[PDB]
Enzyme design. Sequence first.
Site, PDB file in Angstrom:
ATOM      1  N   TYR A  45       0.808  -1.210   0.000  1.00  0.00           N
ATOM      2  CA  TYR A  45       0.000   0.000   0.000  1.00  0.00           C
ATOM      3  C   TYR A  45       0.847   1.268   0.000  1.00  0.00           C
ATOM      4  O   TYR A  45       2.006   1.278   0.407  1.00  0.00           O
ATOM      5  CB  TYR A  45      -0.972   0.071   1.172  1.00  0.00           C
ATOM      6  N   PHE A  55       2.497  11.161   3.538  1.00  0.00           N
ATOM      7  CA  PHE A  55       2.692   9.964   2.737  1.00  0.00           C
ATOM      8  C   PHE A  55       3.411   8.875   3.533  1.00  0.00           C
ATOM      9  O   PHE A  55       4.407   9.145   4.223  1.00  0.00           O
ATOM     10  CB  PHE A  55       3.504  10.303   1.488  1.00  0.00           C
ATOM     11  N   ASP A  56       2.927   7.648   3.411  1.00  0.00           N
ATOM     12  CA  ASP A  56       3.622   6.479   3.927  1.00  0.00           C
ATOM     13  C   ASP A  56       3.316   5.272   3.066  1.00  0.00           C
ATOM     14  O   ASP A  56       2.184   5.115   2.604  1.00  0.00           O
ATOM     15  CB  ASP A  56       3.267   6.152   5.398  1.00  0.00           C
ATOM     16  N   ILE A  75      -8.297  -0.222   9.958  1.00  0.00           N
ATOM     17  CA  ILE A  75      -9.433   0.686   9.875  1.00  0.00           C
ATOM     18  C   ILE A  75     -10.552   0.071   9.030  1.00  0.00           C
ATOM     19  O   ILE A  75     -10.339  -0.763   8.159  1.00  0.00           O
ATOM     20  CB  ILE A  75      -8.985   2.055   9.337  1.00  0.00           C
ATOM     21  N   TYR A 101      -9.833   7.197  11.082  1.00  0.00           N
ATOM     22  CA  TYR A 101      -9.424   7.493  12.449  1.00  0.00           C
ATOM     23  C   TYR A 101     -10.373   8.434  13.190  1.00  0.00           C
ATOM     24  O   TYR A 101     -10.138   8.781  14.348  1.00  0.00           O
ATOM     25  CB  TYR A 101      -7.998   8.065  12.473  1.00  0.00           C
ATOM     26  N   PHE A 118      -5.657   5.846  -0.285  1.00  0.00           N
ATOM     27  CA  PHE A 118      -4.760   4.705  -0.407  1.00  0.00           C
ATOM     28  C   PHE A 118      -4.765   4.141  -1.816  1.00  0.00           C
ATOM     29  O   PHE A 118      -5.812   4.044  -2.462  1.00  0.00           O
ATOM     30  CB  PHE A 118      -5.099   3.510   0.506  1.00  0.00           C
TER      31      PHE A 118
HETATM   32  C1  LIG Z   1     -10.445  -1.667  13.843  1.00  0.00           C
HETATM   33  O1  LIG Z   1      -9.909  -0.347  13.793  1.00  0.00           O
HETATM   34  C2  LIG Z   1      -8.542  -0.167  13.843  1.00  0.00           C
HETATM   35  C3  LIG Z   1      -7.640  -1.216  13.830  1.00  0.00           C
HETATM   36  C4  LIG Z   1      -6.279  -0.894  13.883  1.00  0.00           C
HETATM   37  C5  LIG Z   1      -5.818   0.415  13.905  1.00  0.00           C
HETATM   38  C6  LIG Z   1      -4.380   0.688  13.991  1.00  0.00           C
HETATM   39  C7  LIG Z   1      -3.813   1.388  12.708  1.00  0.00           C
HETATM   40  C8  LIG Z   1      -3.622   0.378  11.639  1.00  0.00           C
HETATM   41  O2  LIG Z   1      -3.472   1.125  10.369  1.00  0.00           O
HETATM   42  C9  LIG Z   1      -4.501   0.995   9.449  1.00  0.00           C
HETATM   43  O3  LIG Z   1      -5.524   0.389   9.686  1.00  0.00           O
HETATM   44  C10 LIG Z   1      -4.190   1.666   8.192  1.00  0.00           C
HETATM   45  C11 LIG Z   1      -4.505   0.675   7.065  1.00  0.00           C
HETATM   46  C12 LIG Z   1      -3.436  -0.466   6.994  1.00  0.00           C
HETATM   47  C13 LIG Z   1      -2.097   0.132   6.709  1.00  0.00           C
HETATM   48  C14 LIG Z   1      -1.736   1.170   7.764  1.00  0.00           C
HETATM   49  N1  LIG Z   1      -2.869   2.208   7.949  1.00  0.00           N
HETATM   50  C15 LIG Z   1      -2.663   3.528   7.753  1.00  0.00           C
HETATM   51  O4  LIG Z   1      -3.592   4.284   8.052  1.00  0.00           O
HETATM   52  C16 LIG Z   1      -1.403   4.033   7.333  1.00  0.00           C
HETATM   53  C17 LIG Z   1      -1.468   5.367   6.714  1.00  0.00           C
HETATM   54  C18 LIG Z   1      -0.593   5.806   5.743  1.00  0.00           C
HETATM   55  C19 LIG Z   1      -0.739   7.118   5.385  1.00  0.00           C
HETATM   56  C20 LIG Z   1      -1.725   7.766   5.987  1.00  0.00           C
HETATM   57  S1  LIG Z   1      -2.454   6.659   7.083  1.00  0.00           S
HETATM   58  N2  LIG Z   1      -0.314   3.998   8.545  1.00  0.00           N
HETATM   59  C21 LIG Z   1       1.044   3.845   8.277  1.00  0.00           C
HETATM   60  O5  LIG Z   1       1.458   3.657   7.110  1.00  0.00           O
HETATM   61  C22 LIG Z   1       2.010   3.936   9.369  1.00  0.00           C
HETATM   62  C23 LIG Z   1       1.996   5.413   9.785  1.00  0.00           C
HETATM   63  C24 LIG Z   1       3.434   3.473   8.933  1.00  0.00           C
HETATM   64  N3  LIG Z   1       1.705   3.189  10.593  1.00  0.00           N
HETATM   65  C25 LIG Z   1       1.444   1.850  10.575  1.00  0.00           C
HETATM   66  O6  LIG Z   1       1.332   1.251   9.477  1.00  0.00           O
HETATM   67  C26 LIG Z   1       1.457   1.235  11.879  1.00  0.00           C
HETATM   68  O7  LIG Z   1       1.291  -0.193  11.756  1.00  0.00           O
HETATM   69  C27 LIG Z   1      -0.002  -0.702  11.792  1.00  0.00           C
HETATM   70  C28 LIG Z   1      -0.161  -2.074  11.839  1.00  0.00           C
HETATM   71  C29 LIG Z   1      -1.395  -2.659  11.910  1.00  0.00           C
HETATM   72  C30 LIG Z   1      -2.527  -1.820  11.847  1.00  0.00           C
HETATM   73  C31 LIG Z   1      -2.417  -0.449  11.805  1.00  0.00           C
HETATM   74  C32 LIG Z   1      -1.167   0.114  11.718  1.00  0.00           C
HETATM   75  C33 LIG Z   1      -6.757   1.474  13.894  1.00  0.00           C
HETATM   76  C34 LIG Z   1      -8.093   1.149  13.831  1.00  0.00           C
HETATM   77  O8  LIG Z   1      -9.136   2.077  13.851  1.00  0.00           O
HETATM   78  C35 LIG Z   1      -8.826   3.440  14.118  1.00  0.00           C
END
Ligand SMILES: COc1ccc(CC[C@H]2OC(=O)[C@@H]3CCCCN3C(=O)[C@@H](c3cccs3)NC(=O)C(C)(C)NC(=O)COc3cccc2c3)cc1OC
Length: 127
Positions: A45, A55-56, A75, A101, A118
Amino acid sequence: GAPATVTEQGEDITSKKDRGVLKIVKRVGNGEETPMIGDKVYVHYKGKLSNGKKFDSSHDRNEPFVFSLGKGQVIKAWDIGVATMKKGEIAHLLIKPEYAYGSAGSLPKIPSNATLFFEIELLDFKG
Ligand SMILES: COc1ccc(CC[C@H]2OC(=O)[C@@H]3CCCCN3C(=O)[C@@H](c3cccs3)NC(=O)C(C)(C)NC(=O)COc3cccc2c3)cc1OC
C-alpha cells in the site's frame, strides 16, 4: 490527480451509501474470487491525507503488509475495501474520517477528522 478521479468515478462501497469509502479499480486482478472474512491477506500500500501530505508506503522497506480480514485489525475502510478486491488487483480508495481514524485521529501524523487516500495492491490471500 488520483484522489480527484476517485471522487468523480469511484464506486461507493459502504453499506450506508454515505460515500464514506469510494473505490476505483486501477489494475484488474485475476480470476473471480475475493477474500472472505477470516482470510489472511497480503498487500502492498501507499497512503496519504487526501491533500497529499503524510505519505507512507509499505514499499519503503519492500515488505508486504499482512492482516486477517474482518478481525478488527485495520481501519474499517480497509476491511470493507480489501474484501472487494481480486488477487493481483490495484485499487484506489478515498476515505472519510468515519471509516478511518474519526475525531480522535492518530496524532501527530493523522489529524482529527482526516480524509485519507490509499493505493492498495492485493498480492494474495489464504484461508
Ligand atoms: C479496527 O480499527 C482499527 C484497527 C487498527 C488500527 C491501527 C492502525 C492500523 O493502520 C490501518 O488500519 C491503516 C490501514 C493499513 C495500513 C496502515 N494504515 C494507515 O492508516 C497508514 C497510513 C498511511 C498514510 C496515511 S495513514 N499507517 C502507516 O502507514 C504507518 C503510519 C506506517 N503506521 C502503521 O502502518 C502502523 O502499523 C499498523 C499495523 C497494523 C494496523 C495499523 C497500523 C486502527 C483502527 O481504527 C482506528
